[PDB]
Amino acid sequence: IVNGEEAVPGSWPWQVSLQDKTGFHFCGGSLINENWVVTAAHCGVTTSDVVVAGEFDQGSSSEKIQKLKIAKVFKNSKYNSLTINNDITLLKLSTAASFSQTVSAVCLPSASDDFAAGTTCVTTGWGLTRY
Template sequence: GQDCKPWDRQYHVRLVSTNKTHENLCGGSLVNHQWILTAAHCWTTMFADIGVNPGPNTSQEITDIRVFSPDHDIMLVKLKNLTPYPYIALPKCLPCAPCLKRSIRVRDTCRNINQHFIHLGKLLMYISGKIYAVVSGGHPSFAFAKPCYFVRVCPYIKWIRSTIKNKP
């Protein structure tokens, strides 16, 4: 890898627990100036550090959490205030999205994985400035170095757009 510049990937968010340890829980991505897309297994009382990659950040309180369904590892969390940081674009979700043409071992080759998951080796979850998946499983220390599981964004795109548009 290579070091990020202060302006690289400013949509990255660190979700941190509000207990006394302030442990890192998960990462997420800003999908507009007030909503973060992340995995539902991260759900707990938390706050968000915005603009964490690679430098100084701004902490914000989470005011709303929307989980798609208990059976799906995807959620949106709402920040108390708008943030000036840039956010990542949502894909148009065409049937043959560009990321899915890459070397991804999909459901047919992965046991116990449903159609909403993809299993990846060394592949990023965003391509051409658009987010296509949320990290769901695998050891966080090995992200993008060893296989891990991602939840596809496209099956949830209507829910994501509706939630971030209709919730003031």
């Protein structure tokens, strides 16, 4: 995020980091329950990648993080790699997340819910802060 600010630690408890086996953060995701993470299809997750829950500072060794293995990747069959439309994947975890003060689920909308233009929302992540 460019021109954002640091979050309060633990205040976005559904936010996860997807890391490859070298420890490199490549995408975010969100917990929707103890067993499932939603992310973008174009992130290209495999069962060799790791879901990291409960993290704030990726440079810290002292945080009580959960490193969760992925059982299966469910890429939405409507995903179109040419247009990047329908850009959603579900990850079924091999090991359930343990919910706590710093790890919990985001709500999903109903299909008919309305979010009007001009509404102020929030986005979070460990993406670049400057290009």
